[PDB]
Write a protein that binds this ligand. Structure first.
Ligand code: ADP
Ligand code: ADP
Ligand code: MG
Ligand code: MG
Ligand code: MG
Lengths: 434, 430, 49
């Protein structure tokens, strides 16, 4: 019914209008500074003015950095574009990591447009040249409420020849795009043959010419791929244009200058509205020194929005460097333009509320003795081992036909499943590399 | 209407120097660094002179000094019609393109060529259109009347005039402007239009094109598709040699004049030694633009070798280059820079918030205060007043932590964070 | 009025059973960007060639 995978219990940060964060609100217990400061970051994205700001989230495991990342991604809403990304994913062999990094900086930003398109539909009456010719075809579309004849290009006529239409077939033709879809044979010719593979559709109601306006949103990187390589078409020249060089290449700066030039012309006409977004990079310590040094100049660039990082290390060696020792795996020049939000750990009662609220979201019933036992396992092995063992206790409750988690079920979970320190303690004694 | 939101490098507009090249204290967004702005003005009049070439310069210094902001001031004071190429040091590393040929591509991208010619234009109001064709044969015969304030005549049209006149919809009320050499029609206005002047006028058109564009165009036909799609690389040098002799012949004939542009390379410390020796040869070529470099690292080991060379660059590069250095700023100049960032960001600040923000800008860094000025207006904005208070700066200080403070927090919590060997205490007890 | 109430509720009654509110679902065809950046430089290709 409802799939829960270490998430979906958080519906945002849950802050007040004054700013003060509650103790128990929105799937969060404790962590006041990262939630309230994270809401300051939420308003900072809602400013639509700031750019180049980089805020890393540094902390230990089971502390709530990625959960805070889903808290800001849920607090922003669907209208603000969110780009999840891992630093291990930026390595590519088709192009460099620079093109994927700056390309992702063009993936964070969004831009909503509004445009009107013309819709034509009707039953095909005549396909004939004009009177003399170079071979164009007047297509007489018979609609219900009107009958009109229209002259078309040879390419859309070629797609009309592709759709195998004839006299008396309902088609769908778009003016600005040129795409052709056939609905089927009209209902007037259903009695011509007793059995036919072509389905019989009724006549389309309404006029021949129709107009509507869409508030469709499309990312600026999608306009960059639309400016980079040919995608598809229904003709041979467009499909071979796709088939010839479909391998993605690096993009020059002048192309982005013309893209945001005509985009700036669209925002000068009042049509579109520029809204920034979020590029969230997971495991920043796995990045190379080249991506760090291009992040130095990339954060000095203009269009780079509020980028949130997540690094789970300290004074370690940077990847790509031999003797450089720096905090968080980040070079000190990039760490100078970074902002650190320290994550706070959780007590025994806060582990009890994590297991409690995770149990209520997981729709399992836990008794108080098993809740205190899972609290002691939360303060003995790990948090992820108790949250990992919430489900097998309910499974053993289902096999034992019980509706609540008991002491013998979680002790049977202790016997059937082992944690880290029992695994290391068992693997310490070896006959032949146990 | 160059696209301009609030950048770190948006307030700097021009170098801001006098006629005697002595820099003012507060001029055109740049405050301080008198010797760096004066020497950068010597580079500015070096590009504006254009009689010399093949020179490399370097701008060095500690962080929070603005060497990239100084080169931004040079590029902003350079003005239009002069090409400026700003590339990264790690941008030359590519898989489809070699690093040396990409560096040669940047060296061809830096210098442009101005070529001018004259064309004729007939602009005037249409009175009526009377074409003549045949129902079976063809061979269209067009006639229309063109009118202005002091001329009104009937123009007979050819085949291509009715081809462009019927492929583009036009009326009697609609007004056209026809070029004779191009053959395309400009349907400008209908009866915007309100025209004056003579009917047929001749004006000059000037086009600016860099040498790299001529290199990939004269490489092959699909080098234009590689000019847009970016799938170029590794051009044969016969195009470069014959294009150099053709450009020199265009300079000798007086047909094409060239503009010496500036090549700016950011983060030049992590560059390969092959590109270093390639710059060591390419600085002595005839068509060699002025190169400005910004070495950002310190003394370390160069990539490609084992020894720790000083400056991060070999001495063959630094022998043929001039070096400008920058120094740290005073306490008053940080308050002045935060004041002009308050003027750029349109943020009204108080005196005590500027004093405490100046103190925490001296203590921590320039960039942290340059972002605390941004968030302080929004902690103030949540209180529904435009005035920034000291409580917003203190809250923005306790919320957004410095790097050294969380370095102390990391060193206090090393059991929480994962170590170099992958060991991490994810539990609390035992 | 009493007519604007019923004439306002007949749209929601024209929504809850079946979306008969003019029923136009967009066909989601591509964008109509007509600029074609290369055509602004095609004349430069003509002058250089
Ligand atoms: N304050 C909190 N309240 C509720 N659950 C939390 C909290 N902090 C962490 N968690 C839970 O811990 C789990 C793992 O944490 P995670 O975000 O993966 O840590 P990290 O970001 O260090 O990898 C998440 O599924 C999340 O539900
Ligand atoms: N002379 C100056 N005038 C105005 N701002 C400056 C100046 N020098 C440095 N800055 C500030 O320094 C910041 C960028 O420093 P940067 O040029 O990146 O240093 P580096 O090049 O050493 O990394 C900018 O936000 C800018 O406001
Ligand atoms: Mg994580
Ligand atoms: Mg720099
Ligand atoms: Mg030499």
């Amino acid at each position: 019914v409802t799939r829960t995978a270490a998430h979906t219990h958080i519906k945002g940060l849950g802050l007040d209008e004054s700013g003060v964060a509650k103790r128990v609100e929105g799937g969060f217990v404790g962590q006041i500074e990262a939630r309230e400061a994270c809401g300051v970051i939420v308003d900072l994205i809602k400013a639509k003015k700031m750019s180049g700001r980089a805020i890393l989230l540094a902390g230990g495991p089971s502390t709530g950095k990625t959960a805070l990342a889903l808290a800001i991604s849920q607090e922003l809403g669907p209208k603000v574009p969110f780009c999840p990304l891992v630093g291990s994913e930026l390595y590519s062999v088709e192009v460099k990591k620079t093109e994927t990094l700056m390309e992702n900086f063009r993936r964070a930003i969004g831009l909503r447009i509004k445009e009107t398109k013309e819709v034509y539909e009707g039953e095909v009456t005549e396909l004939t040249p004009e009177d003399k010719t170079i071979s164009h075809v007047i297509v007489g579309l018979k609609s219900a409420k009107g009958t009109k004849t229209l002259r078309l290009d040879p390419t859309i006529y070629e797609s009309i020849q592709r759709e195998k239409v004839s006299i008396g077939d309902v088609i769908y033709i778009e003016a600005n795009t040129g795409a052709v879809k056939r609905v089927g044979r009209s209902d007037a010719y259903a009695t011509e043959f007793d059995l036919e593979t072509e389905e019989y559709v009724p006549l389309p109601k309404g006029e021949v010419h129709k107009k509507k306006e869409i508030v469709q949103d499309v990312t600026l990187h999608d306009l960059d791929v639309a400016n980079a390589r040919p995608q598809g078409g229904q003709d041979v020249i467009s499909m071979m244009g796709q088939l010839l060089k479909p391998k993605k290449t690096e993009i020059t700066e002048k192309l982005r200058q013309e893209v945001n030039k005509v985009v700036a012309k669209y925002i000068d006409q009042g049509v579109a509205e520029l809204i920034p977004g979020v590029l969230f990079i997971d495991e920043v310590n796995m990045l190379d020194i080249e991506i760090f040094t291009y992040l130095n100049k990339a954060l000095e660039s203009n269009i780079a929005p509020v980028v949130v990082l997540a690094s789970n290390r300290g004074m370690t060696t940077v990847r790509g460097t031999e003797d450089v020792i720096s905090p968080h795996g980040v070079p000190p020049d990039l760490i100078d333009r970074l902002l650190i939000v320290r994550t706070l750990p959780y007590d025994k009662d806060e582990i009890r509320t994590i297991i409690e609220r995770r149990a209520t979201v997981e729709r399992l019933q836990v008794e108080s003795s098993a809740l205190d036992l899972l609290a002691t396992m939360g303060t003995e092995t790990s948090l992820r081992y108790a949250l990992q063992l919430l489900a097998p206790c309910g499974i053993l409750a289902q096999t034992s036909n019980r509706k609540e988690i008991v002491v013998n079920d979680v002790n049977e979970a202790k016997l059937l499943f082992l944690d880290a320190k029992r695994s290391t303690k068992i693997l310490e004694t070896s006959a032949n590399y146990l | 209407k160059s696209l301009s939101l609030i950048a770190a490098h948006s307030h700097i507009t021009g170098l801001g120097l006098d006629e005697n090249l002595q820099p003012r204290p507060t001029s055109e967004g740049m405050v301080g660094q008198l010797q760096a702005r004066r020497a950068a003005g010597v580079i500015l009049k070096m590009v504006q002179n254009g009689t010399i070439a093949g020179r490399a310069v370097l701008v060095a210094g500690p962080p929070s000094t603005g060497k990239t902001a100084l080169a931004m001031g040079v590029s902003q004071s350079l003005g239009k019609d002069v090409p400026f190429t700003a590339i990264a040091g790690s941008e030359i590393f590519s898989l489809e393109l070699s690093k040396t040929e990409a560096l040669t591509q940047a060296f061809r991208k830096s210098i442009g060529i101005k070529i001018k010619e004259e064309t004729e234009l007939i602009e005037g109001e249409v009175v009526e259109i009377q074409i003549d064709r045949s129902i079976t044969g063809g061979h269209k015969q067009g006639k229309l009347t063109i009118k202005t304030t002091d001329m009104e005549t009937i123009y007979e049209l050819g085949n291509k005039m009715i081809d462009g006149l019927t492929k583009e919809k036009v009326l009697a009320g609609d007004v056209i402007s026809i070029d004779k050499a191009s053959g395309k029609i400009t349907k400008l206005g209908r009866s915007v239009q309100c025209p004056e002047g003579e009917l047929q006028k001749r004006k000059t058109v000037v086009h600016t094109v860099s040498l790299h564009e001529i290199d990939v165009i004269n490489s092959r036909t699909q080098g234009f598709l590689a000019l847009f799609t970016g799938d170029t690389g590794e051009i044969r040098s016969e195009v470069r040699d014959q294009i150099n002799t053709k450009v020199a012949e265009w300079k000798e004939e007086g047909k094409a004049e060239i503009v010496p542009g500036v090549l700016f390379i950011d983060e030049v410390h992590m560059l390969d030694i092959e590109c270093f020796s390639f710059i060591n040869r390419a600085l002595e070529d005839e068509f060699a633009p002025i190169v400005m470099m910004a070495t950002n690292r310190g003394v370390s080991k160069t990539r490609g070798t084992n020894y720790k060379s000083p400056h991060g660059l070999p001495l063959d590069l630094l022998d043929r280059s001039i070096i400008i250095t920058t120094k740290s700023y005073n306490e008053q100049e940080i308050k002045t820079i935060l004041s002009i960032r308050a003027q750029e960001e349109e943020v009204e600040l108080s005196s005590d918030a500027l004093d405490l923000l100046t103190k925490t800008g001296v203590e921590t860094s320039l960039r942290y205060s340059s972002n605390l000025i941004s968030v302080a207006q929004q902690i103030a904005m949540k209180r529904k007043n435009n005035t920034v208070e000291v409580e917003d700066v203190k809250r923005a200080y306790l919320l957004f932590l410095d790097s050294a403070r969380s370095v102390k927090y990391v060193q206090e919590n090393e059991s929480q964070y994962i170590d170099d060997q992958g060991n991490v205490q994810i539990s609390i007890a035992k | 009025n009493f007519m604007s109430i019923v004439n306002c509720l007949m749209q929601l009654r024209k929504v809850c059973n079946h979306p008969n509110l003019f029923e136009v679902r967009p066909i989601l065809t591509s964008f109509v960007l007509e600029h074609c950046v290369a055509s602004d430089y095609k004349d430069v290709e003509r002058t250089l060639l």
